RNA sequence: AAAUUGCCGGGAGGGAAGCGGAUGGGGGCCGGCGAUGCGCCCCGGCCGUAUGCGGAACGGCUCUUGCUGGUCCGCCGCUCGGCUCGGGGCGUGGACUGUUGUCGGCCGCGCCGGCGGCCAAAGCCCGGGGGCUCCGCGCCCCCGGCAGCCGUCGUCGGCACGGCCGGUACCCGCGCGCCGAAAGGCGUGCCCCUCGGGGCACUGCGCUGCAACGCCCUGCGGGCUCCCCAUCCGACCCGUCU
RNA sequence: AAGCAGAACUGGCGAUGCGGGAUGAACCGGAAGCCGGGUUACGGUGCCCAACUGCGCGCUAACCUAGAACCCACAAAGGGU
RNA sequence: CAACUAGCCCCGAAAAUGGAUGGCGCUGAAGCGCGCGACCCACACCCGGCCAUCUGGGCGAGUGCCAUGCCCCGAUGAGUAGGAGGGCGCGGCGGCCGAUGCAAAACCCGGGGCGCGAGCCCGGGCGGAGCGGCCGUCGGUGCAGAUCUUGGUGGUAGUAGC
RNA sequence: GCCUGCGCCCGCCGCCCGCCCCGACCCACGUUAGGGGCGCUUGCGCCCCCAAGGGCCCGUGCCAUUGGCUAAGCCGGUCCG
């Protein structure tokens, strides 16, 4: 109600600005709009149907919005997280950054606790009161495009070639990711050891005993 | 292993499927009533909405080379004063499961 | 449009199956539904558990009526001439070889059907008629 | 053919109660599961338009008659170029079915906050008087100044989550210059506030589903029947008379 | 007198399941397409049997039948330091 | 101290197949009266999806043709006696089209699939000569009964018995 | 009490299955109004104190592969009574 109020009692204040900026050029997309584009020479049948174009544009923006705020409860970079779902669930991990996909980069340092770089969902997570200082960690290398798991197109190679069956369908470890992970992990360990006994704590796991209440437990 | 940590085999807080949603006269199997262990009140069971449920069972036959099978579900909303909850499953749980324990996860966490 | 309607029909099912009352204990009394004419029937009075009666509301979506679960409309195809009509539809209609048609005549239907790109069930029926499990 | 009978197999079990079914799950049995998708380029393969030629079914029409518009095939001339099957070479990734993330709609869910009503006043400190008690403490009652916080009525305001359905296939929603991973913001005039900010005005077209995992063949989801366990109206099964 | 015979008004049953009254053609609640999700009625919440062994304030100690939901499964005059 | 008022409990209150607040049992109730919340809960109510029916529209200018079509509405739907409406199946006849000894029809099938249903479709097995669909036409036209008719076959029962 | 067409049975360890009503940290003064500890008047005493829990696993890559070690235990299996 409170965020939506400006738009609600305006109607299209943001979208008004864009038209007037375009009009600042002079005389433009009123004239251009009628002339603009393609049509007339069809395919197949009537062509009654759908997408590309227009439709894609609001949808991509709207799907971006849950990634902070709605899911998040509040969480700053370098918060300690509890993964309650995912593979690595029950591990406490440190938050590196939020991706464009909306999945979170994390990494527990590999040697001490098994957690790799990995993408995990925000929705799963309990935000704990602890913060570990991620002041001088180079999280930058790891990005959204970094996390493409190769599909079973053919062989991993260039393409167009007759291939063999020894693909990894639901998995794939790039060699490059393993080399990179060691470097990023090193900085994190320094912060972790600064506060005592945090290092052992992450690996141990949290779970609720009989008689424990998840409602009362809230970190 | 990977996904492995340092102890607790029991990952979840316990719960019990008492029965299905019911009159004295009839049952509706579409919604199931679960009394969740350690949950005393109406307020406390309000937390449990949205959580994932697994009924894990073993069976004589293999499937995709495993004898263990599971039916998943979700907690819909609370039911009654005693900490009973309403739940839906993807396919209904077998009603032989009356009196069985079922698992209610932390898995999607609102907190 | 067409795709979520298909999902609604197939997943929900009103495959209730309308069995006649006391069909189970009298063998000669037919499985086929006939409406209990007498007042005294529980089924007539609409007691639940006594097998619910066929009504129009049980009925599926209009689009998904007389469709194969592939979302194709099934047509039994007698001969080569009828395949030309199916060609107009392509995706929308299916070809299924008739019972009457013998094995040699099935083959010519299959090869023509391939050109239309309405391969589904047409080929399958023919293959059994050759010799196959 | 039905009925019945025999054999055998499967389910079930020799600690247990029968309307013979429905409803749910498991076994047992069996059928199904784009020919495997797209863009591009290289080679191989085949064909050729325009225009001239040569033979024709056509059109609007007129309809004696006339004028404008044909396409096509034969296949020669004169200039160019393209497509398709397969292979090579690159980029995007399509195959039933099951699962998870999300946006919107509907509905529930717990919790927090504000103002006013009900002359407002419980209330506390200060002040005054009275009664009762007449053993005095104490008790009560009322009035004037006061932090204060209260039960009930009305209304508005804010959060945190989830179910279900659908992905919005023509005006629901929205983009079309720029930066910004991102979300998001970036005109100008007007007026209120005159602080922080706000409200209010100002162009036309095009168009409605996004993220992910398994596998489609190995192998397997599944469907269907019986059975066992769970569950249930079970007025005995139907008809008739009433 | 009758679950009786006969009228007056109205609703039902007959033409009525479903939910409630343990159970019941007629009482109670409500008329019923097919489903998902919500929310109730009647009636309940010790267990059966879905649901507070919840809170509050009384009363009751029944060896000659303790008591326990309209219709309804009965019951009175009269007695008790 | 006496006479009252009215609560529950006690008496009055005794029947036969053993027995019924429905049961167990329950005594700061799970009893009885009453209050306050929370909660449970019908095919009811709401919202959404969807079916037909009814109502109101709409879209044919031809040259895809169901225009008795298609598409948008919203509300409604129990249902005996009974009416009307729209269909399905069988036999034969006029039309029209198909199928066949390289395997028709028929029959069998805890084999698949479609339709709300009436029914239909297809596969496999058995089989060996004619048949089915569609458009009209027509009936000696669809069965569970009738103390049914006629044929077959059980349990009775390997029993009464001889 | 007995159990050979080389079957059967127990001991010993090896591998595999199938369950649980879902195992997957564990738990004693006595009593329905007392218990403990202490000084002792040595008791049905005195004084203190408590009523809503404890301890362990909790860290053994659901428990990897290796080397050694503590206080010399903790825990399982063997074995003494």
UniProtKB/TrEMBL annotation, chain A:
UniProt record similarity statement: Belongs to the eukaryotic ribosomal protein eL6 family.
Any single GO CC term annotated in Swiss-Prot or TrEMBL for this entry: ribosome
Protein name from the UniProt record: 60S ribosomal protein L6
A molecular-function term among this protein's GO annotations: structural constituent of ribosome
Entry annotated with the keyword Ribonucleoprotein: yes
Source taxonomy: Eukaryota, Viridiplantae, Streptophyta, Embryophyta, Tracheophyta
Pfam families in the cross-refs: Ribosomal_L6e
GO biological process: translation
Domain of life: Eukaryota
């Amino acid at each position: 109600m409170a965020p939506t109020s400006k738009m609600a009692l305006g109607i299209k204040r943001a979208s008004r600005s864009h038209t007037y900026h375009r009009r600042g050029l002079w005389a433009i997309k009123a004239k251009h709009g009628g002339a603009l584009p393609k049509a007339e020479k069809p395919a197949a049948i009537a062509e009654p149907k759908f997408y590309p174009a227009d439709d894609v544009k609001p949808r991509t923006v709207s799907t971006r919005k849950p990634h902070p705020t709605k899911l998040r409860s509040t969480i700053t970079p370098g918060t300690v997280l509890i993964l309650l779902a995912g593979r690595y669930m029950g591990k406490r991990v440190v938050f590196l950054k939020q991706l464009q996909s909306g999945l979170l980069l994390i990494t527990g340092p590999f040697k001490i606790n098994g957690v790799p770089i990995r993408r995990v969902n925000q929705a799963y997570v309990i935000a704990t009161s602890t913060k570990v200082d991620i002041s001088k960690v180079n999280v930058q290398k790891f990005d959204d495009k970094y996390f493409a798991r190769e599909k079973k197109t053919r062989a991993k190679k260039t393409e167009g070639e007759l291939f063999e069956s020894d693909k990894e369908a639901t998995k794939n470890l790039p060699d490059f990711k393993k080399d990179d992970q060691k470097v990023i992990d090193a900085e994190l360990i320094k912060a972790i050891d600064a506060v005592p006994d945090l290092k052992n704590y992450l690996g141990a796991r949290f779970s609720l005993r009989d008689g424990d209440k998840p409602h009362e437990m809230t970190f | 292993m990977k996904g492995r940590q340092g102890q607790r085999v029991r990952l979840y807080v316990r719960g019990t499927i008492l029965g299905y949603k019911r009159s004295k006269s009839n049952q509706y199997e579409n919604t199931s009533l679960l009394q969740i262990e350690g949950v005393n009140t109406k307020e406390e069971v309000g937390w449990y909405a949205g959580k994932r449920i697994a009924y894990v069972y073993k069976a004589k036959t293999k499937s995709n080379d495993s004898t263990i099978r599971c039916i998943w579900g979700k907690v819909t909303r609370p039911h009654g004063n005693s900490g009973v909850v309403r739940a839906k499953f993807r396919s209904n749980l077998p009603p032989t499961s009356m009196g069985k324990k079922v698992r209610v996860f932390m898995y999607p966490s609102s907190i | 449009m067409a795709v979520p309607l298909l999902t609604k029909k197939i997943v929900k099912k009103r495959v209730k199956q309308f069995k006649r009352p006391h069909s189970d204990r009298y063998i000669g009394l037919k499985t086929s539904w006939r409406r209990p004419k007498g007042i005294d029937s529980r089924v007539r009075r609409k007691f639940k558990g006594c097998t619910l009666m066929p009504n129009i509301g049980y009925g599926s979506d209009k689009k998904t009526r007389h469709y194969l679960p592939n979302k194709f409309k099934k047509f039994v195809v007698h001969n080569v001439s009828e395949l030309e009509l199916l060609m107009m539809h392509n995706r929308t209609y299916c070809a299924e070889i008739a019972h009457n048609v013998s094995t040699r005549k099935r083959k010519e239907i299959v090869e023509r059907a391939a050109q239309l790109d309405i391969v589904v069930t047409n080929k399958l029926a023919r293959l059994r008629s050759q010799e196959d499990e």
